[PDB]
Amino acid sequence: GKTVLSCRKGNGSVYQVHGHKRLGPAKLRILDYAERHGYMRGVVKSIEHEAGRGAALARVEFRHPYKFRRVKELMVAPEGMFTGQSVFCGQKAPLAIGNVLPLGQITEGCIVCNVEAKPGDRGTLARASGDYCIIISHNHETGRTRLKLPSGQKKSVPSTSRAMIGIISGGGRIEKPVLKAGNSFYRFRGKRNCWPKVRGVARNPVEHPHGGGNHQHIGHPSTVSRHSPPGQKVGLIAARRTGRI
Amino acid sequence: KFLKPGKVVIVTAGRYAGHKAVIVQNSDIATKERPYGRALLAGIKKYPKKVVRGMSKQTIARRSQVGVFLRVVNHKHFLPTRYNVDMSKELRGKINVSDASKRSRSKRLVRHVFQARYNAGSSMWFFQRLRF
Amino acid sequence: SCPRVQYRRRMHYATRGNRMMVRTPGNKLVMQKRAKRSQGIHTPWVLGHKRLGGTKALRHIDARLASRHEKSVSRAYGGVLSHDQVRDRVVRAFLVEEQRIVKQALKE
Amino acid sequence: PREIKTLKEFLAICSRKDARCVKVKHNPSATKFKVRCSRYLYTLVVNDKKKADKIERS
Amino acid sequence: TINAKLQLVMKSGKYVLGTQQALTTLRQGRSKLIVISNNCPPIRRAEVEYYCTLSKTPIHHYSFRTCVLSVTNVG
Amino acid sequence: KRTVKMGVMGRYGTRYGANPRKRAKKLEVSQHAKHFCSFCGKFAFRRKAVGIWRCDGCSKTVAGGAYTLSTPNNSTVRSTVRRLRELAKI
RNA sequence: UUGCCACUCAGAACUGCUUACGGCGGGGAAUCCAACUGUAUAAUUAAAACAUAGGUUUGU
RNA sequence: GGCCAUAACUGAAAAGGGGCAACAGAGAACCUGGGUUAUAUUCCAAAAAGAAAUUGCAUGUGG
Ligand SMILES: [Mg+2]
Ligand SMILES: [Mg+2]
Ligand SMILES: [Mg+2]
């Protein structure tokens, strides 16, 4: 038949993140010489709200180590970080709530948000609102820290990655219920174009594998294979445990 | 005790807002033209620019001058500090009166002092620039 | 006899840019553009975004030709900073070098 | 247009080189001196017999 | 004894609190004791600290919010 | 004493069911509530945007908490920091 | 201390229609279905369908 | 041989090639009066019917 809405979405024509009222990509300051062999102080000046994100983005300025400017860094804001806090992000940095001292140098059992997997990618993990990681184990013989991602899935990363100290701002967003379709309209209008979700079982059997019939029923089991081709990999993909627990 | 004459301050909150200036005569209470603490002070409008050590010539004179103002600034517009200049609160602190026809010649002697006291090595701090 | 009016210029749209209605010495009531009165000179948005005193709100044409003392006071950081944000910047520029050179040098 | 608030500065700027014309004016309650320079017109309005004086020569 | 060391201080005379005025009492040198509330920004909670160490005045930090108190009479 | 049982949520009336209104009322009453700023001292924080709190009287913007000022796990985090600073230094 | 620049309501009698532009909800009792506002078969289908908030699941 | 002056041809640091895309965003130095069969914030000529603002280059009074 025709291509399915999910398949007809990696074309990214209309279903492409909007990001016009967004600020730049929020990420740690670039891992230069200064954040390896010392620290550098930076003042938090503005905490804005990138449209389409529950976490506050704090505009942190540092000094450019080499030219004479003041380079300006956009970072996700750990909760509690206020305007004018003098954030330190280096090697010898203190461990106050917001600093970006390296991950294998943070004490164990600590609480770290905006951790980064690879040493330099400027912050990937634990970076949505209220999310964070707990440092569990350091392996100084291997040089790799095992932190516990905000999904239970605890992984090992190198002990030279960087990480903020705290919880990402905007925690507790997901608990205030929406109460109306219109407050879901304005949530996704800063996010991408996936709303409303028409149920594939309410579609025609040309546009979706579930659609069809005189009754709205999924004809065959919803759990589809991991290996199934796109346009078929719809429903519960490689569902290993199924249904209410 | 804190604002003794000859003690250098920073002239906060004025045309000369960050300049360093020495108190030469403080006061307590005036009747109608100064309800405020009335520390007259002379200070720097023209800092002597850094000695280039290069073309040591009359340009070193044209770039090591000290321009001087005299104002009776209120005490809530200073910021006293640890230092002094010892610029003769009893010898020079009286031949620098503030009445009319004096701010013409009295100003040109506390200027005439900073001329030489910077050309000589005395403070090396009072003649820097308060960078803000 | 209540005349109506026209958008005299070639833009006939009611955008916040036009905002035009005056009586004429020929009694030919007709409406003219305004200037979009800009907000004036302000402190930085970070530092408590406030209007500066002693400064005008001149537009790109009034500002490009009027004198320089219509847009700045005679202080340091005049026309960018208010007296509040100068006087606090001079003690912090001095109480820091004071707490420094006594505490960066205590090692004999 | 400026209005010369002077008898000296006016007679200076009125006797300048531009002097496109000097339109003598008579109106109620005053007597007005329109000099037409190249870019302004400078007026000197007066309430006195000094109008007819500086009218003959200026 | 913060509220007690300051109680009879009110039984004595010329109670003065307020940042701007806790300095008018230092320039005109009549300030016996000065108290700094520990909920003050480190600018003039570091500037009035500069004056007490500049005029050998005593200092105190304890914690109509009262942010600073400079007294001239004791008790 | 208007509106005896469901308060701020009177905006909706019969709609949205009782418990979604009541779960969202707990969080709608706090984001509009002024909080305390250990800075200025007096209650001054409003909620200029989700996870963003501004204090006019303090003139400083704390970040954090979507419908309150400090999520009560930051309350534990904020201590564990100094817990793992001071005791981990002295 | 009574001077000058206000049409709104309230009441009184008076009289006279129980006949008077225009504009301007019929209401109640129930049962069924959908919670709701919403969208939607342009040119026969506006619904009980879609959406929806909510709930859960799966992958990661 | 230097008073003074234009010019040549070098070449001082300076990261991030250009370039379009808005007759409703931004920006944008002019206002009345009046004498066309039909144009005018467009035209009017010298008692510019007037009055302004403004850009470029110039001579020159002010330091
Ligand atoms: Mg099919
Ligand atoms: Mg199938
Ligand atoms: Mg503005």
UniProtKB/TrEMBL annotation, chain B:
InterPro entries associated with the record: KOW, Ribosomal_eL27, Ribosomal_eL27_KOW, Ribosomal_eL27_sf, Translation_prot_SH3-like_sf
GO biological process assignments: translation
Record domain KOW: where: 5-25
Gene Ontology molecular function terms on file: structural constituent of ribosome
One GO cellular component, as annotated: ribonucleoprotein complex
The UniProt record lists the keyword Ribonucleoprotein: yes
Family: Belongs to the eukaryotic ribosomal protein eL27 family.
Protein name: Ribosomal L27e family protein
Lineage: Eukaryota, Discoba, Euglenozoa, Kinetoplastea, Metakinetoplastina
Automatic annotation (TrEMBL), chain D:
Molecular-function GO terms, alphabetical: structural constituent of ribosome
Keywords for the protein's UniProt record, in alphabetical order: Ribonucleoprotein, Ribosomal protein
Full protein name: Large ribosomal subunit protein eL38
From-to range in the entire protein, with total length: 2 to 59 of 83
Family note: Belongs to the eukaryotic ribosomal protein eL38 family.
Residues spanning the signal sequence: none
One BP annotation, GO: translation
CC annotations in GO: cytosolic large ribosomal subunit
Native source organism of the sequence: Leishmania donovani
Automatic annotation (TrEMBL), chain E:
Alphabetical UniProt keywords: Ribonucleoprotein, Ribosomal protein
Sequence ranges assigned to domain Ribosomal protein eL8/eL30/eS12/Gadd45 in this UniProt record: 1-75
Record-level Gene Ontology MF annotations: RNA binding
Signal peptide positions (record): none
GO cellular component term, pick one: ribosome
Tree of life domain: Eukaryota
Keyword set includes Cell membrane: no
Family the entry assigns: Belongs to the eukaryotic ribosomal protein eL30 family.
Protein name: 60S ribosomal protein L30
Organism this protein belongs to: Leishmania donovani
Residue numbers of the full-length protein present here: 11 to 98 of 104
From TrEMBL, chain F:
One GO CC term, this protein: ribonucleoprotein complex
Signal peptide extent: none
Family matches, as Gene3D superfamilies: 2.20.25.30
Domain of life: Eukaryota
Keywords in alphabetical order: Ribonucleoprotein, Ribosomal protein, Zinc
Gene Ontology terms, MF aspect: structural constituent of ribosome
GO BP field: translation
Keyword Iron-sulfur: no
Classification via InterPro entries: Ribosomal_eL37/eL43, Ribosomal_eL43, Ribosomal_protein_eL43, Ribosomal_zn-bd
Entry keyword annotation includes Phosphoprotein: no
Disulfide bonding pattern of the chain: C37-C40, C37-C55, C37-C58, C40-C55, C40-C58, C55-C58
NCBIfam families named among the record's database cross-references: eL43_euk_arch
Family, as annotated: Belongs to the eukaryotic ribosomal protein eL43 family.
HAMAP family: Ribosomal_eL43 (MF_00327)
PANTHER family tied to this protein: 60S RIBOSOMAL PROTEIN L37A, LARGE RIBOSOMAL SUBUNIT PROTEIN EL43
UniProt name for this protein: 60S ribosomal protein L37a
